[PDB]
Amino acid sequence: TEKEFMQHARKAGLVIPPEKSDRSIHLACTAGIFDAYVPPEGDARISSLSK
Amino acid sequence: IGIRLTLPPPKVVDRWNEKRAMFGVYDNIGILGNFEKHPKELIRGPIWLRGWKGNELQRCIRKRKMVGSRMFADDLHNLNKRIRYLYKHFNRHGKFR
Amino acid sequence: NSDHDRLHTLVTEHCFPDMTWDIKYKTVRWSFVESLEPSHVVQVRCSSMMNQGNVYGQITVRMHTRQTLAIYDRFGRLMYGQEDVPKDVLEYVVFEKQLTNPYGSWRMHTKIVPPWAPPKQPILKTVMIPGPQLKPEEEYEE
Amino acid sequence: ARNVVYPLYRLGGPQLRVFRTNFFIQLVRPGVAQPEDTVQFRIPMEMTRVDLRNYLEGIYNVPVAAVRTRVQHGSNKRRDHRNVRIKKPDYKVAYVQLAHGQTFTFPDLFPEKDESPEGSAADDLYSMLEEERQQRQSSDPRRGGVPSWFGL
Amino acid sequence: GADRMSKWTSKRGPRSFRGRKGRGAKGIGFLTSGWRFVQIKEMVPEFVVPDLTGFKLKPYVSYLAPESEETPLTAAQLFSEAVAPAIEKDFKDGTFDPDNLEKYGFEPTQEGKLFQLYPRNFLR
Amino acid sequence: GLEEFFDDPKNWGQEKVKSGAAWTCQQLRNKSNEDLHKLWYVLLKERNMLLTLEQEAKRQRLPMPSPERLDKVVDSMDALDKVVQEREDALRLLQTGQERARPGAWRRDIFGRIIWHKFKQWVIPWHLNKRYNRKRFFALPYVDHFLRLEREKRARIKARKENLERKKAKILLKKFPHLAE
Amino acid sequence: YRARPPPRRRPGPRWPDPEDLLTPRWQLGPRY
Amino acid sequence: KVTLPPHYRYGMSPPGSVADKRKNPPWIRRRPVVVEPISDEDWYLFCGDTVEILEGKDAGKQGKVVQVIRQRNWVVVGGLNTHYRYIGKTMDYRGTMIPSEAPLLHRQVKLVDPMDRKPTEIEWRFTEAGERVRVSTRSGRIIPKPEFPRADGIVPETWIDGPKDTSVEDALERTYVPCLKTLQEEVMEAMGIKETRKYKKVYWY
RNA sequence: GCUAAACCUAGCCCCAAACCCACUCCACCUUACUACCAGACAACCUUAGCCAAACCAUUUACCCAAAUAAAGUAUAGGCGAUAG
Ligand SMILES: [K+]
Ligand SMILES: [Mg+2]
Ligand SMILES: [Mg+2]
Ligand SMILES: [Mg+2]
Ligand SMILES: [Mg+2]
Ligand SMILES: [Mg+2]
């Protein structure tokens, strides 16, 4: 009659792996573009004007 | 319930290993070897069972008089109780007289 | 075809969530009908030398082609787009490649959406936007 | 010293001297309001107030006037998964009062300003997460769950 | 209903039990008539603290140091470094006798010494 | 002063504190007894500062800045203590020839097992000690049965331990036959 | 494979060590 | 210190970490994984050594080894044989996908010769000086142990002594003069403490 | 479709072989795990009974140092059960 539910898991952080570790996460792609590109306004009109 | 839902792993058996391919060899060591050796001498196992056969009461009695002085205190005590029980069962209980 | 095994070789890890998360339990019928104007390399910019031991390069490509999109919900009902009539799409596709990695390759990274872009095609169904929920003590302000 | 055999003393014997001591004390912040001169230490059980008096005067050159010690019981109520009691070790608490009217206040070893790094810190993994989260926006309610990746 | 698997300490038992049990601290005196405690000054361990002014060594060691191999000290090694040089000089001079081993530094007996080696009568 | 229980005020609140390596046993064998005696309290006063900082870290529910600093000091304290004891042990063998500082002997207890009895120091000789004589250093014949029972208990534990190892080796060759080859 | 060498009755007299306590007393007498 | 279950299952996370405890609570008991017994001397794969994947999703590719687990005979290659997982997931945010490497057994990778970027087998030998080295079976050449950053991360080449760090001139100076006196006897000579009283005999038993 | 149901190891058993363990520091026969004072206190001695004899009262197998055989033989025994 002393049995109880196995409710023991607790929340933790997923942002950073354990500290003082030689292994680090290898990233294949960067988060964002290094320099933002702003196409000139009205470039849709230039689509028709192919020349 | 009580029956598995998945097949057990396949039982691969090597029928031509060293032990199976050479099983039964030298079993005629006496007839074919001028009777210098005996086929029961090939038997390996407990020293109280080599070339001998008997019922449970005889096996316990034979074991006690051969390796009884080497048995552990708890094991020897259990053997003595088993002999006491088997003696009463065989000599006092049963259907036939 | 939900070929996510090969899609990782064509798009980056940043681009993948934008593509597959919203179509997890939906059916997409996308096709390429015709191409109007050839793609032109607008801008090429690389990363700084040895930021984290690796060097990245990005190439901006402008594409203006007709596309057909048909999106069905989990039950197969039509949800967005028309499977018959294609319409022109003018989008700036940005690619990326890890130059330091010998096994790297150019993959789709993101899409540039200009502030002057026309509004997208409206959806078939109607939507409701509820107002703020008001507790009894709180009083609404217009 | 602890875990060592003290040489027996008889009348007329030499002074007992210890050259290397294994006693390690730790200054702690009292949990209750204390007088200004009162200083609280945690000392090993084998340590006496006479030894602690010479320990502070001899090593740290701190004049001490009164030393009061008590033994703190460690709770044995905690039980692990095997229903076996887990014992928190007992420790001795010492209250030391400064001699010449000096007042000691426990310093703030974790100031908030000093914790905050003035210099810019740019973790690669954190920078990846921060940029993408700002770039990505919540789905437009007027879109009704239709994916925004497609430009059509 | 008593806990027989918990440590028996001075906090358990009646008044006579609690006062008689200690915590491991060494005694520094004795009780006289009238329950009066007499503290013996010589029984209190006196700390021999050296002067640390102008001391070169520091708690940590810089990483820019060679990785010297560890050589545990042995009795044979100590004899060669300390006693052997003196014997060699006396051996060459020709004035050597076992009766003078006390002059080299050998101690025939530990009695009459402030710091006896066996059994040792000093703290760590 | 009591300022020695805390680190430098400029280091308070910092996430990391640079520290060097710990003294090794070979590096401490070049120092004299006087130098090691002075170095002992340099490390001891540093250890009390680290214990104070570690306790306040738990009190404030924040991680310790450089927990590896405490391990370095503890290793330094043990290494320094090893050097000093080793020098005395070597000197004790030269002057007396004893490998143990504290006297002792091998005696059977009341339970019949061989133990190393460490001698205590008494003002009176042993034949006059009332409390010493109550202790029994001899086993009566009724203990010999339990000595066999304990010996056979150890034999079963060792027999199970040896048999289990052979079971592991035989099974481990089924999945990796190249080990035998 | 190849069979192991046949078990043969080991030739020559068998003289156990008389100083061994596991030697049966009948292998050390004149009759033996 | 170290508290490991008798049949503890080693994983990607280091033992004692927050995730490791949740993955391997003290009470759980899983089937132990069979591990081929390889002596530490016979092991020939080190961190920072380029190896080629023989079997896997990306076979025949060469990559640097960032971590090795000797308990399970595991080798991890950066950027190779990697799946994808969302990191930093929250209730409102779906998460950011990152490539996570999958461990590879020592039999699934094969060391590459420095001269020829092809997989090859190596055998330990000894040079003229006596230093133990690994020599490839085909076209035997010396394969030096790659330099890898230390676990703590301190670089000796860029180390600046702190206020509590003993200098090299002081940490290596030899001041010990071997004599026949103990530390206690020597210190009282320097301190000048005098004790004319004589220690009395005590019975030991 | 809930509760559940399934799993393969942990380890163990019987043999063979070989005669096993116990000083890191400190504490431990007093109220064990307790630094530190006149003791004189000292160990050894048939097992019984259940049970069988259809009760029970004499009696009733219990390794004593080589497997086999002599042999369940000579003997013993309310000359009974049984023992040998
Ligand atoms: K009856
Ligand atoms: Mg019958
Ligand atoms: Mg008190
Ligand atoms: Mg109870
Ligand atoms: Mg009857
Ligand atoms: Mg009756």
From Swiss-Prot, chain B:
Part of the whole protein covered: 32 to 128 of 128
Keyword Transmembrane helix: no
Gene Ontology biological process terms from the UniProt entry: mitochondrial translation; translation
Keyword Mitochondrion set for record: yes
Protein name stated in the entry: Large ribosomal subunit protein mL51
Leader sequence residues: none
Subunit structure as annotated in this protein's UniProt entry: Component of the mitochondrial large ribosomal subunit (mt-LSU). Mature mammalian 55S mitochondrial ribosomes consist of a small (28S) and a large (39S) subunit. The 28S small subunit contains a 12S ribosomal RNA (12S mt-rRNA) and 30 different proteins. The 39S large subunit contains a 16S rRNA (16S mt-rRNA), a copy of mitochondrial valine transfer RNA (mt-tRNA(Val)), which plays an integral structural role, and 52 different proteins. Interacts with OXA1L.
Record-stated family: Belongs to the mitochondrion-specific ribosomal protein mL51 family.
Primary location: mitochondrion
Any one GO cellular component localisation term in the record: mitochondrial large ribosomal subunit
Molecular function GO terms recorded: structural constituent of ribosome
Superkingdom assignment: Eukaryota
Keywords tagged on the record: Mitochondrion, Ribonucleoprotein, Ribosomal protein, Transit peptide
Protein's cellular compartments: Mitochondrion
Swiss-Prot record, chain C:
Annotated source species: Homo sapiens
Positions spanned in the full protein: 154 to 295 of 306
Family that this chain belongs to: Belongs to the mitochondrion-specific ribosomal protein mL45 family.
Protein name according to UniProt: Large ribosomal subunit protein mL45
Subunit comment: Component of the mitochondrial large ribosomal subunit (mt-LSU). Mature mammalian 55S mitochondrial ribosomes consist of a small (28S) and a large (39S) subunit. The 28S small subunit contains a 12S ribosomal RNA (12S mt-rRNA) and 30 different proteins. The 39S large subunit contains a 16S rRNA (16S mt-rRNA), a copy of mitochondrial valine transfer RNA (mt-tRNA(Val)), which plays an integral structural role, and 52 different proteins.
Subcellular compartments: Mitochondrion
Function: Component of the mitochondrial large ribosomal subunit (mt-LSU). Within the mitochondrial ribosomes, required to direct the nascent polypeptide toward the tunnel exit and position the exit at a distance from the membrane surface.
Signal peptide residue numbers: none
From Swiss-Prot, chain F:
Modified residues (N6-acetyllysine): 82
Entry's family note: Belongs to the universal ribosomal protein uL29 family.
GO cellular component terms given for this protein: mitochondrial inner membrane; mitochondrial large ribosomal subunit; mitochondrion
Subcellular localization: Mitochondrion
Residues of the whole record sequence present: 63 to 243 of 250
Gene: MRPL47
GO process terms (BP): mitochondrial translation
The keyword Oxidoreductase belongs to this UniProt entry's keyword annotation: no
GO molecular function: structural constituent of ribosome
Keywords: Acetylation, Mitochondrion, Ribonucleoprotein, Ribosomal protein, Transit peptide
Keyword Kinase: no
Record text on subunit structure and interactions: Component of the mitochondrial large ribosomal subunit (mt-LSU). Mature mammalian 55S mitochondrial ribosomes consist of a small (28S) and a large (39S) subunit. The 28S small subunit contains a 12S ribosomal RNA (12S mt-rRNA) and 30 different proteins. The 39S large subunit contains a 16S rRNA (16S mt-rRNA), a copy of mitochondrial valine transfer RNA (mt-tRNA(Val)), which plays an integral structural role, and 52 different proteins.
Name this polypeptide is given: Large ribosomal subunit protein uL29m
From Swiss-Prot, chain G:
Induction behaviour: Down-regulated by p53/TP53 in apoptotic cells.
Biased composition (Basic residues): 1-12
Region feature Disordered, mapped onto this chain: 1-22
Tissues expressing the protein: Widely expressed. Highly expressed in the thyroid gland, heart, lymph nodes, trachea and adrenal tissues. Expressed at lower level in liver skeletal muscle, kidney, pancreas, testis, ovary and stomach. Barely detectable in adrenal adenoma and papillary thyroid cancer.
Subcellular location: Mitochondrion; Nucleus
Remarks, miscellaneous: Cells overexpressing GADD45GIP1 were more likely to be in G1 and less likely to be in S phase and grow more slowly than control cells. Inhibiting the expression of GADD45GIP1 promotes cell cycle progression.
SUBUNIT field: Component of the mitochondrial large ribosomal subunit (mt-LSU). Mature mammalian 55S mitochondrial ribosomes consist of a small (28S) and a large (39S) subunit. The 28S small subunit contains a 12S ribosomal RNA (12S mt-rRNA) and 30 different proteins. The 39S large subunit contains a 16S rRNA (16S mt-rRNA), a copy of mitochondrial valine transfer RNA (mt-tRNA(Val)), which plays an integral structural role, and 52 different proteins. Interacts with GADD45A, GADD45B and GADD45G. Interacts with NR4A1 via the NR4A1 AB domain. Interacts with ATAD3A and ATAD3B. (Microbial infection) Interacts with the human papilloma virus type 16 (HPV 16) minor capsid protein L2.
Protein source organism: Homo sapiens (Human)
Originating gene: GADD45GIP1
